[PDB]
Structure 1
Amino acid sequence: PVTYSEPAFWCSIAYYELNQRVGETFHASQPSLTVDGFTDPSNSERFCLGLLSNVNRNATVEMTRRHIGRGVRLYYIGGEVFAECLSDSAIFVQSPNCNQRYGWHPATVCKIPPGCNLKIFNNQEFAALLAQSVNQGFEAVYQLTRMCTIRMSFVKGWGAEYRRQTVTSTPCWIELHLNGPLQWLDKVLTQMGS
């Protein structure tokens, strides 16, 4: 017996400082939300990071947390996801669905200057990749979980051309989980066998 239900929250965001989890996981219910570095504790549309505390927080993270400002705005219109840079400092996003959409290396990191926006995710694109992946085996489908996960950095970029080579080296970074695509992946994973 298999039963499925539409998720209440279309995504969940986890905040990270260096390689450590800081704060609780935030689940976005509204189609629009802002991830800022301020201190509002009771806003279902704002993921205020300024109030999260880390006893092992160093100096450079403290300085980086001051430049988040208005942070990033995420909206989910139709079947596509966008990230808008409201911060006075550029943000760096690593979205496999976006990277593949343009024929870039999977680890590619996109810089979003203040005021600009970008098509972070596309449901139709993912559905197409999920279809042509059942022909490559369990491994290919299992690794499609990273397609549902997206990582962003608030001030400092990482990857090639930079000194930080991994996202765990950036002072302030988050990781999104797209519940919609994740549920579609579950339907296909069960049928893939071992």
Structure 2
Amino acid sequence: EPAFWCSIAYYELNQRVGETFHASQPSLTVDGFTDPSNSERFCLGLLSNVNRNATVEMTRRHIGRGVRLYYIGGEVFAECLSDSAIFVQSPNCNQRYGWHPATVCKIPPGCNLKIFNNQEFAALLAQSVNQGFEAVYQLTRMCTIRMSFVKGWGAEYRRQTVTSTPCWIELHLNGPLQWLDKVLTQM
């Protein structure tokens, strides 16, 4: 419905790095290489950071081919093409399987994970309008997916917050955000 089905912001620890990437096509790859003018690849290897430390420098060498994000049939999937694992925190996915909303799920190389389903969010949007304003307001976090390369964060890892991982991205799902907006304005 909007021009870009998602927007991605890349971070290094607690600092944002580079411009915002807007996905023009249904499929997308976030790699650590250096192509600056491909609408299908979000290349992180070209982005500079004058406060970058060594651990981030080492982590960026292992991003490799990175993660593939594609949006088909009202569903978006994340497939780990890197030789290192990626770690996804998707509240819509955790909702579907009944996990804690903050659950981080590791995707090993060659694996694939359904990180978001439109109909499930649309159903939760309809269930939450009945619950009041705050219930619909808190749904903004459902439109956001955060994933990190190589290193994960949570109660199992030494890094406790996503701001402690050396390389991570944040996805905004513009489709759901627009539907959430149209409900919020009329309430």
- For normalisation by structure 1, the TM-score amounts to 0.95
Pairwise CA distance, 1:139: 1.1
2:141 paired with 1:146? yes
Structure 1: gaps (5+ residues)? 1-5
Q: Which residue of structure 1 aligns with residue 19 of structure 2?
A: 24
Pairwise CA distance, 1:135: 1.6
Query: Deviations for 1:115-142, whole angstroms, at most 9, x for unmatched residues?
Result: 0000010000000000000122111111
Q: How many residues align?
A: 187
| Whole-Å separation in 1 of the counterparts to 2:101 and 2:83 | 27
Match of 2:156 among 152, 156, 161: 161
Pairwise CA distance, 1:21: 0.6
SS of residue paired to 1:132: helix
Kindly report the root-mean-square deviation, in angstroms, between the aligned alpha carbons of the 2 structures: 0.6
Structure 2: gaps (5+ residues)? none
| Whole-Å separation in 1 of the counterparts to 2:167 and 2:138 | 25
Pairwise CA distance, 1:78: 1.3
- For normalisation by structure 2, the TM-score amounts to 0.99
| Whole-Å separation in 1 of the counterparts to 2:13 and 2:136 | 29
Match of 1:95 among 90, 105, 111: 90
SS of residue paired to 2:41: coil
Identity among equivalent positions (%) equals: 100
SS of residue paired to 1:107: coil
| Whole-Å separation in 2 of the counterparts to 1:164 and 1:143 | 25
| Whole-Å separation in 2 of the counterparts to 1:171 and 1:139 | 33
Match of 1:67 among 62, 66, 88: 62
| Whole-Å separation in 2 of the counterparts to 1:189 and 1:124 | 18
Pairwise CA distance, 1:146: 0.7
Query: Deviations for 1:150-173, whole angstroms, at most 9, x for unmatched residues?
Result: 000001010011111110000000
